[PDB]
Every structure is written in structure tokens, then in C-alpha cells.
Design an enzyme around this catalytic site. Structure first.
Site, mmCIF file in Angstrom:
data_model
loop_
_atom_site.group_PDB
_atom_site.id
_atom_site.type_symbol
_atom_site.label_atom_id
_atom_site.label_comp_id
_atom_site.label_asym_id
_atom_site.label_seq_id
_atom_site.Cartn_x
_atom_site.Cartn_y
_atom_site.Cartn_z
ATOM 1 N N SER A 128 0.839 -1.196 0.000
ATOM 2 C CA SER A 128 0.000 0.000 0.000
ATOM 3 C C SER A 128 0.882 1.257 0.000
ATOM 4 O O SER A 128 1.783 1.384 0.838
ATOM 5 C CB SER A 128 -0.905 0.061 1.247
ATOM 6 O OG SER A 128 -1.774 -1.054 1.324
ATOM 7 N N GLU A 171 -4.578 6.272 -2.710
ATOM 8 C CA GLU A 171 -3.834 5.043 -2.615
ATOM 9 C C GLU A 171 -3.493 4.450 -3.976
ATOM 10 O O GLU A 171 -4.328 4.412 -4.865
ATOM 11 C CB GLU A 171 -4.600 3.996 -1.823
ATOM 12 C CG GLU A 171 -3.758 2.763 -1.542
ATOM 13 C CD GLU A 171 -4.373 1.784 -0.564
ATOM 14 O OE1 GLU A 171 -5.360 2.099 0.114
ATOM 15 O OE2 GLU A 171 -3.817 0.686 -0.472
#
Ligand SMILES: Nc1nc2c(ncn2[C@@H]2O[C@H](COP(=O)(O)OP(=O)(O)OP(O)(O)=S)[C@@H](O)[C@H]2O)c(=O)[nH]1
Ligand SMILES: [Mg+2]
Lengths: 205, 176
Positions: A128, A171
Site C-alpha cells: 500500500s 492510494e
């Protein structure tokens, strides 16, 4: 060179240009990861990427891999992305007191760069990241990593509720078993807070 | 079904440990994250199932500029202080209330007193008395909650788990 988004306007602009037409199943897989990455990543690290150990995670992991391995699911540009980490990213012998009164322990720091600087490594879990340096609290954490992500790298951009339980993180999710090279591990002073942080430059291979 | 909670309060007042213990991890002793990563809590109250996305924040003034990125579209705020820190309570009306009311106008607030285990702790009493302070009394927490227009006041201890589920149940009721 690599694109760097400096503000919300640039990050949104770049966001709109990324692939978003995943299937219902693919979105639910991506969104499920964002609810809590721990069961995915801990399982993958613990079992060296072997799935058969637990049928339930096997099924979820294969469904996510499928969304991220899709043809269109990739970055068009060279781009820099960011994440923060606690000190034990470098091993359970380190904890966050490695920074004491905004100063990084030089002895421990030198052990870390001796062990990891120049290292190529394969991450069993997913990675991530954010396209915005400010967008996590990655400036708060003791270790900040910049990933240089080359065009064609697979992944998913998520900044809306259909794709993430935490919209507004800008993200970029990278696939599991991503290989990266740690080019540099160094210390830098934040100009705002005046504290040291460990900085990592990694390149996605 | 889906709601957003943001937790705020002074540095070291117990925000991250509260989130960690709510996630059913043990109280962290050695490896204490600065900010907890994504964790959606599954909570049921009054016959409704909720997926409560919990957003941890850095409480130190140094990170004031970053915190607004967490605030948009929040359904409930957990505004925290520590029961062992009267100073952290005074920052409720001075810092946290004006901030949250600016970025999260009319979003419900739960006022939360953390580290309830330290109220009847000798070391805490003795350290605090050196500065003519004592642990925050429940009445003082309640008064502050009334003064700021909070949904409610709750006390908890991440260390003992006392009150932790009740904090998040009330937050979910406020989010609905
Ligand atoms: N006695 C007691 N100590 C606690 C409790 N919760 C947290 N602590 C201690 O307080 C300290 C700070 O807690 P933490 O949860 O890290 O604060 P924070 O609000 O996240 O701090 P920050 O990230 O904005 S700087 C830690 O040393 C932790 O062990 C509690 O319920 N009881
Ligand atoms: Mg914290």
C-alpha cells in the site's frame, strides 16, 4: 524521470487518468483489502506466499491478484509513491525508540543501512502506497519510503468508496510478490518538525 | 451500514492503543505504532450492523497541517484526553474543539477519557500532585462534554480493556 504529485489538484488529475472499470468482484476484493490488510499480508509473509495453508485467505488472495493482474490495471507513467513504516520493518530487534528526542540512533541506523542498503527483495504481501507524500501520516512515522514505480507496473489506484473503505488516501496498491531494490537508506531532517526520519529510496523492478 | 470515525486528542493520550485494543490485539508493550493502519470495525447496536472505518491521527502540534486530510465526510469524532493529564483535558476546549468544529462542522463528538486505570494509581497521583494536579474526575469529564456539546462522555482503559467496547458502541450510535 518520475512524476511527483505535490498537491490534491495534481493527485486528482493523475487519479482520473488511471484505470477504474474493474468488475464487481474485483472491486470487492480491492475494497476488502483496504478494510484491514493484516490478514492478507501477515498470512503471506508467514507462509512465504503459499496459499494452501488456509483455504479462506487463498480464495481472497487469488481474487485480489486477479484484479491487480488484469491487463489495464497498471500505471501509465513513471511515478513516485510513498509509505511510512515503524522501525521494525527492518526487523523485530528494532522498535520506535530508535528515534529519541527527534534524533535517529546512529549505531542502529548504520546496522540497518549495512544490512539493507543495496538489497533487492521480494515482498510476499501487497504494498500500500500513496501518490501524495502528505496523505498518510507517513511524515509522522520513523521510516519513510519512496518507491520509484516504472510505467507498466501493475496495481490499482483507489480514492473512492467503491474501491476503498478509506477514501481520501490517494492510494496506489501494488501486487503481492513485487520485487524492489533499496537504492539508498539515509537520514533527513523534516524542516517543519525539526526531527530526523529514516528515509528509504526503493525502485520497483 | 458504512460509517467513518476519526479519533483525535493530544500526543500520547492513548489514541493508537485504544484502536489496537478495540481490534482485539493485546495492549502493545514493545512495538507501539505511531498511527494505526486501516481497520474497519464491525459493530452491531440496536439491530443495525455497522462497518466503522477508524481513522487514527497524530496528536502533536507538529502535524497540525496533515490532520485536515483525515477530516472530510466524518460521521463521528472520538475526541480524547487522558485521565492522568489535566493538561490534555484543557486542550479539549482550547485546541481540539475549535479544530474539529472548523473542519467537521456539526459532526457528532464523543468525549473520551483514556487511561482510566490511572485514576487510582499511586505513581500517577504522586507525579500529578508535584504540579498541584490530580487525575481528572468523572464529573469534570462530564462537565467538559456538556460544555462542548458532545453526544456523550465515556471513560476507558486500553490497558485493562475497561470501557473500550462501550466507547465504540456509543460512537456507532452517534454515527447513525
Ligand atoms: N496506563 C495506561 N497507559 C496507556 C493506555 N493507553 C495508552 N497508554 C500508554 O500511553 C502511551 C501513548 O499511547 P498512544 O496510544 O501511543 O498515544 P497516542 O494518542 O496514539 O499518541 P500520538 O500517536 O498522537 S503521539 C503509550 O506509552 C501507552 O503504553 C491506558 O489505557 N493505560
Ligand atoms: Mg498514535
Amino acid at each position: 524521470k518520475y512524476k511527483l504529485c505535490t498537491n490534491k489538484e495534481e493527485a486528482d488529475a493523475w487519479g482520473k487518468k488511471q484505470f477504474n472499470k474493474w468488475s464487481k468482484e474485483e472491486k470487492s476484493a480491492i475494497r476488502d483489502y483496504t478494510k484491514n490488510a493484516r490478514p492478507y499480508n501477515e498470512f503471506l509473509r508467514m507462509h512465504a506466499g503459499k496459499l494452501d495453508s488456509d483455504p479462506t485467505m487463498k480464495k481472497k488472495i487469488e481474487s485480489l491478484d486477479k484484479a491487480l493482474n488484469r491487463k489495464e490495471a497498471k500505471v501509465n507513467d513513471n511515478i513516485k509513491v510513498y509509505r511510512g513504516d515503524d522501525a521494525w520493518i527492518f526487523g523485530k530487534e528494532y522498535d520506535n525508540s530508535i528515534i529519541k528526542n527527534g534524533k535517529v540512533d546512529r549505531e542502529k541506523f548504520k546496522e540497518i543501512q549495512k544490512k539493507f542498503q543495496g538489497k533487492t527483495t521480494t515482498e510476499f504481501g501487497y504494498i500500500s502506497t500513496s501518490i501524495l507524500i502528505d496523505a498518510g501520516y507517513a511524515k509522522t512515522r520513523p521510516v519513510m519510503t519512496e518507491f520509484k514505480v516504472g510505467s507498466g507496473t501493475h496495481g490499482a489506484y483507489m480514492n473512492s468508496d467503491d474501491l476503498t473503505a478509506y477514501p481520501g488516501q490517494y492510494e496506489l496498491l501494488l501486487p503481492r510478490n513485487t520485487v524492489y531494490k533499496i537504492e539508498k537508506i539515509y537520514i533527513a531532517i523534516d524542516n517543519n518538525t525539526q526531527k530526523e526520519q529514516i528515509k528509504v529510496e526503493a525502485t520497483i523492478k | 451500514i458504512r460509517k467513518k470515525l476519526v479519533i483525535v486528542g493530544d500526543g500520547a493520550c492513548g489514541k493508537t492503543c485504544l484502536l489496537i485494543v478495540n481490534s482485539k490485539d493485546q495492549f502493545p508493550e514493545v512495538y507501539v505504532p505511531t498511527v494505526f493502519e486501516n481497520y474497519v470495525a464491525d459493530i452491531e447496536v440496536d439491530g443495525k450492523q455497522v462497518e466503522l472505518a477508524l481513522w487514527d491521527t497524530a496528536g502533536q502540534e507538529d502535524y497540525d497541517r496533515l490532520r485536515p486530510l483525515s477530516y472530510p465526510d466524518t460521521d463521528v469524532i472520538l475526541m480524547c484526553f487522558s485521565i492522568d493529564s489535566p493538561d490534555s483535558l484543557e486542550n479539549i476546549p482550547e485546541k481540539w474543539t475549535p479544530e474539529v468544529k472548523h473542519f467537521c462542522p456539526n459532526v457528532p463528538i464523543i468525549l473520551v477519557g483514556n487511561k482510566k486505570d490511572l485514576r487510582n494509581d499511586e505513581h500517577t497521583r504522586r507525579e500529578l500532585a508535584k504540579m498541584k494536579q490530580e487525575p481528572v474526575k468523572p464529573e469534570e469529564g462530564r462537565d467538559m462534554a456538556n460544555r462542548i456539546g458532545a453526544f456523550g462522555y465515556m471513560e476507558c482503559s486500553a490497558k485493562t480493556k475497561d470501557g473500550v467496547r462501550e466507547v465504540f458502541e456509543m460512537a456507532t450510535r452517534a454515527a447513525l
